[PDB]
Amino acid sequence: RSYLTPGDSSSGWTAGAAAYYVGYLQPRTFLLKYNENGTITDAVDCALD
Amino acid sequence: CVNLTTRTQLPPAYTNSFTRGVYYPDKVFRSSVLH
Amino acid sequence: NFNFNGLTGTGVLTESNKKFLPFQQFGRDIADTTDAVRDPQTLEILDIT
């Protein structure tokens, strides 16, 4: 709230520094590499190149 | 329940996702294998 | 013959050193046939033969 924000008193709202990204999924065949503990350490997209 | 005041509109940008976006398809354990 | 959360199979359950992830339940091999299972009640991994 800009009314009760440190250093600001004007009416309104101010947003602190925030960055986010949005992506959309598509049906793609993937080759997932499972390591010895079973964690996926790498992947290859079967339609990239 | 009121619209925000003094919003500045700018065209959205795009960035490279690289390899991010990989998730386990199912709760199945696989060891040292290419699936 | 056993039934783990609907996973029906037949074999000799034993103790295994395989380390599943906290969310992983089943276990598979190259031939996509079940080979290990996490007991729903107690948290240990048992092989299937």
Side-chain angles (χ1 to χ4, degrees):
Chain A
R1 179 61 175 174
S2 299
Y3 184 80
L4 277 171
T5 304
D8 187 3
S9 60
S10 61
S11 300
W13 309 82
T14 180
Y20 74 86
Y21 316 81
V22 168
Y24 301 117
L25 304 180
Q26 293 82 17
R28 299 292 179 90
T29 303
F30 269 54
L31 191 65
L32 306 168
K33 180 181 181 180
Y34 298 79
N35 69 328
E36 65 183 1
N37 307 28
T39 56
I40 292 170
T41 61
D42 190 327
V44 166
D45 180 7
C46 296
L48 186 72
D49 49 4
Chain B
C1 302
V2 299
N3 292 317
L4 175 65
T5 57
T6 66
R7 163 173 286 101
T8 303
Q9 184 62 16
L10 190 70
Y14 303 81
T15 184
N16 181 22
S17 59
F18 297 85
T19 63
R20 298 281 161 175
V22 292
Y23 63 89
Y24 295 83
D26 43 30
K27 302 181 291 301
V28 172
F29 171 87
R30 302 185 170 86
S31 182
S32 306
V33 56
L34 278 296
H35 181 53
Chain C
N1 57 5
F2 52 90
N3 186 330
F4 289 76
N5 291 320
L7 183 63
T8 59
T10 309
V12 179
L13 312 185
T14 71
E15 283 288 1
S16 76
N17 55 334
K18 299 183 179 182
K19 312 299 294 186
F20 286 16
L21 297 182
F23 66 95
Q24 288 174 327
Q25 298 295 321
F26 306 161
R28 287 186 180 272
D29 63 331
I30 297 89
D32 81 8
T33 185
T34 312
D35 63 358
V37 165
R38 161 164 291 187
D39 180 357
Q41 295 180 0
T42 183
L43 277 296
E44 83 305 358
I45 297 89
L46 311 170
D47 290 329
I48 304 173
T49 307

